[PDB]
Write an enzyme that holds these catalytic residues in place. Structure first.
Site, short mmCIF file in Angstrom:
data_model
loop_
_atom_site.label_atom_id
_atom_site.label_comp_id
_atom_site.label_asym_id
_atom_site.label_seq_id
_atom_site.Cartn_x
_atom_site.Cartn_y
_atom_site.Cartn_z
N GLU A 7 0.88 -1.15 0.00
CA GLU A 7 0.00 0.00 0.00
C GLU A 7 0.92 1.21 0.00
OE1 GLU A 7 -2.45 -1.47 3.50
OE2 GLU A 7 -3.99 -0.96 2.01
N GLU A 140 13.90 1.65 -6.15
CA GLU A 140 13.96 2.08 -4.76
C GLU A 140 13.09 1.21 -3.85
OE1 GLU A 140 16.32 3.57 -4.45
OE2 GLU A 140 16.60 4.56 -6.40
N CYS A 194 3.24 -5.96 7.28
CA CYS A 194 2.27 -5.03 6.69
C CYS A 194 1.92 -5.23 5.22
CB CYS A 194 2.74 -3.59 6.91
SG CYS A 194 3.99 -2.97 5.73
N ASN A 212 -5.48 -5.03 -13.94
CA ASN A 212 -4.26 -4.79 -13.17
C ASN A 212 -4.12 -5.80 -12.04
OD1 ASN A 212 -6.06 -4.03 -11.18
ND2 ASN A 212 -5.55 -1.84 -11.25
N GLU A 219 -15.78 -3.11 -10.18
CA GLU A 219 -15.36 -4.43 -10.65
C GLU A 219 -15.89 -5.48 -9.69
OE1 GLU A 219 -11.00 -3.88 -10.38
OE2 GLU A 219 -11.05 -3.15 -12.45
N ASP A 273 -8.90 -11.71 20.93
CA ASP A 273 -9.26 -11.53 19.53
C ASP A 273 -10.34 -12.51 19.07
OD1 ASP A 273 -7.50 -12.52 16.49
OD2 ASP A 273 -9.40 -11.45 16.74
N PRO A 274 -11.62 -12.09 19.09
CA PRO A 274 -12.70 -12.99 18.65
C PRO A 274 -12.58 -13.27 17.16
CG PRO A 274 -13.52 -10.78 18.80
CD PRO A 274 -12.15 -10.77 19.46
N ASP A 288 -11.39 -7.41 10.78
CA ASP A 288 -10.91 -7.95 12.04
C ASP A 288 -11.45 -7.17 13.24
OD1 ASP A 288 -7.58 -9.08 13.10
OD2 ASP A 288 -9.61 -9.57 13.78
C1 LIG Z 1 22.13 8.49 -13.88
N1 LIG Z 1 22.81 8.11 -12.63
C2 LIG Z 1 22.86 6.81 -12.28
O1 LIG Z 1 22.39 5.88 -12.94
C3 LIG Z 1 23.58 6.53 -10.93
C4 LIG Z 1 24.94 5.90 -11.24
C5 LIG Z 1 25.68 5.58 -9.93
C6 LIG Z 1 25.73 6.33 -8.80
N2 LIG Z 1 26.46 5.72 -7.86
C7 LIG Z 1 26.93 4.55 -8.31
C8 LIG Z 1 27.73 3.53 -7.74
C9 LIG Z 1 28.05 2.38 -8.52
C10 LIG Z 1 27.56 2.27 -9.86
C11 LIG Z 1 26.76 3.30 -10.41
C12 LIG Z 1 26.44 4.46 -9.63
N3 LIG Z 1 22.79 5.58 -10.09
C13 LIG Z 1 21.60 5.83 -9.56
O2 LIG Z 1 20.99 6.90 -9.67
C14 LIG Z 1 21.00 4.65 -8.77
C15 LIG Z 1 21.20 4.94 -7.27
C16 LIG Z 1 20.67 3.85 -6.33
O3 LIG Z 1 21.36 2.88 -6.02
N4 LIG Z 1 19.44 4.06 -5.88
O4 LIG Z 1 18.85 3.17 -5.04
C17 LIG Z 1 19.49 4.46 -9.11
C18 LIG Z 1 19.23 4.10 -10.60
C19 LIG Z 1 19.64 2.65 -10.89
C20 LIG Z 1 17.76 4.28 -10.99
CA LIG Z 2 -10.83 -10.75 15.12
CA LIG Z 3 -8.65 -3.53 -11.35
CA LIG Z 4 -0.70 -3.19 4.01
ZN LIG Z 5 20.05 1.17 -5.93
#
Ligand SMILES: CNC(=O)[C@H](Cc1c[nH]c2ccccc12)NC(=O)[C@@H](CC(=O)NO)CC(C)C
Ligand SMILES: [Ca+2]
Ligand SMILES: [Ca+2]
Ligand SMILES: [Ca+2]
Ligand SMILES: [Zn+2]
Ligand SMILES: *[C@@H]1O[C@H](CO)[C@@H](O[C@@H]2O[C@H](CO)[C@@H](O[C@H]3O[C@H](CO)[C@@H](O)[C@H](O)[C@@H]3O)[C@H](O)[C@H]2NC(C)=O)[C@H](O)[C@H]1NC(C)=O
Length: 415
Positions: A7, A140, A194, A212, A219, A273-274, A288
């Site tokens: 979420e 991320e 979670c 999706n 739906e 917890d019923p 719940d």
């Molecule tokens: C355009 N810039 C990039 O692609 C740089 C390159 C880079 C930064 N530090 C490094 C250490 C080792 C190898 C490459 C880099 N990397 C990122 O932005 C990545 C950073 C990361 O690990 N986010 O969780 C997130 C990205 C993959 C979306």
């Molecule tokens: Ca319950």
């Molecule tokens: Ca849907």
């Molecule tokens: Ca959740």
């Molecule tokens: Zn990364």
């Protein structure tokens, strides 16, 4: 249900609002798009992503967004923990910023799903291409789900994988085999408690999309594209029930039919917890229900707390095994020191010693009489997580008293 659910709540910094000339509709339509792709990107991992919240700081940022990634992730995490989560039930949160981060374009904690403060990441509005931002986001959240960067013998095909340390100018929608195993590895060893619950249709703010694999408003069911659909009760293309199907979703729906009324659909955790039961005319298990906190439980040795009956005895057992019980009162006086392990709570990263009266609500002490040795005041401490070993909230600390926020107070006024 093999699938886990994230979420998600997204936050847009003022830099982005300005960059988009204040077109909030455009920002929103764009987030819906991005999250939709993230959800598609996560089928492979048996994980679903649903946007349940979206906050736009069009007035002013609620933290100082700096080009220094670390600072910004940490502040966002704090803000999320002390504010957002306080008023909005969600599992993960990401911050989008038009500010150009220094070394990176995204940053996130590893293996922190559900952590109040660490279950977050920040994403730079690197490109106007939704697939590109969708990749950063999946990346991320990947770290959040315990995934590390690919290396050596990791593959996702002759394509550019998501978890590579650098984004490719030719981003693909694929996770590597390494990413997969490491993810479920985290999901097993560590419990992302979670991400078990499935979000209600009314909890998703994005526009409902049939296909999706997420049941949304309007739906009757949703089993994905007609090609992946394995739900006998649903017509994939329209998300409508078909054939002798009285339902096609829910814990009270067995083989396309309502389960017999009175069928338990959520087992009871404790006398606090019923359990819940199916009605016989509905496919969804009712929400719940827990008995009111403060209710005496386990033959008067405790009081109810959120569906459980936490007592110092079980806590000692779970911490040290058999032959261990609540230490004598004198043991707990150690909690008045405010030292590395003896304390009641934390405030601004400071260990607050227990007032003489709240001593049974701090670090837990147990007398150990297990084979091999003697130890009157056994206590558990690990800087890996200082909270482990602390008396749980809601634990009976004396006759008629419970622990609440590190204080031993009257049960009657505790809830
Ligand atoms: C355009 N810039 C990039 O692609 C740089 C390159 C880079 C930064 N530090 C490094 C250490 C080792 C190898 C490459 C880099 N990397 C990122 O932005 C990545 C950073 C990361 O690990 N986010 O969780 C997130 C990205 C993959 C979306
Ligand atoms: Ca319950
Ligand atoms: Ca849907
Ligand atoms: Ca959740
Ligand atoms: Zn990364
Ligand atoms: C993710 O998938 C990888 C396979 O796609 C897997 O193993 C690695 O796969 C390559 C071939 O795809 C293996 O073979 C290569 O190396 C051997 C030994 O030198 C050569 O004989 C072959 O011709 C070829 O060049 C690798 O040996 C193999 N590497 C490993 C780690 O064993 C990855 O292991 C998979 N990731 C995980 C851990 O699930």
């Amino acid at each position: 249900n093999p699938f886990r659910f994230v979420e998600l709540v997204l936050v847009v910094d003022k830099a982005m609002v300005t960059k988009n000339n204040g077109d909030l509709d455009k920002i929103k339509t764009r987030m819906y798009e991005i999250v939709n792709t993230v959800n598609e990107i996560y089928r492979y991992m048996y994980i679903h992503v649903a946007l349940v919240g979206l906050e736009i700081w069009s007035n002013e940022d609620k933290i100082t967004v700096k080009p220094e990634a670390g600072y910004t992730l940490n502040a966002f995490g704090e803000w999320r923990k002390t504010d957002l989560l306080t008023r909005k039930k969600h599992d993960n949160a990401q911050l989008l910023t038009a500010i150009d981060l220094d070394r990176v374009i995204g940053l996130a904690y590893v293996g922190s799903m559900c952590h109040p403060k660490r279950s977050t990441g920040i994403i730079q509005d690197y490109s106007e291409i939704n697939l590109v931002v969708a990749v950063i986001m999946a990346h991320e959240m990947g770290h959040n789900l315990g995934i590390n960067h690919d290396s050596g013998y990791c593959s996702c095909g002759d394509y550019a994988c998501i978890m590579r340390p650098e984004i490719s100018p030719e981003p693909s929608t694929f996770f590597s085999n390494c990413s997969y195993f490491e993810c479920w590895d985290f999901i097993m060893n560590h419990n992302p408690e979670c991400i078990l619950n499935e979000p209600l249709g009314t909890d998703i703010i994005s526009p409902p999309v049939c296909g999706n694999e997420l049941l949304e408003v309007g739906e009757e069911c949703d089993c994905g594209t007609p090609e992946n659909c394995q739900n006998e009760c649903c017509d994939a293309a329209t998300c409508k029930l078909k054939s002798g199907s009285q339902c096609g979703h829910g814990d009270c729906c067995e083989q396309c039919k309502f389960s017999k009324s009175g069928t338990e659909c959520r087992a009871s955790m404790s006398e606090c917890d019923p359990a819940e039961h199916c009605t016989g005319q509905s496919s969804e298990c009712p929400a719940d229900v827990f008995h009111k906190n403060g209710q005496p439980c386990l033959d008067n040795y405790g009081y109810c707390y959120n569906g459980n009956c936490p007592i110092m005895y079980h806590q000692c057992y779970d911490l040290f095994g058999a032959d261990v019980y609540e230490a004598e009162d004198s043991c707990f006086e150690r909690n008045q020191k405010g030292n590395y392990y003896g304390y009641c709570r934390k405030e601004n990263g400071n260990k607050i010693p227990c007032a003489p009266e709240d001593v049974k609500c701090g670090r837990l002490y147990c007398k150990d009489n297990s084979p091999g040795q003697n130890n009157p005041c056994k206590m558990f401490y690990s800087n890996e997580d200082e909270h482990k070993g602390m008396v749980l909230p809601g634990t009976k600390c004396a006759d008629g008293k419970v622990c609440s926020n590190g204080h031993c107070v009257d049960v009657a006024t505790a809830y």
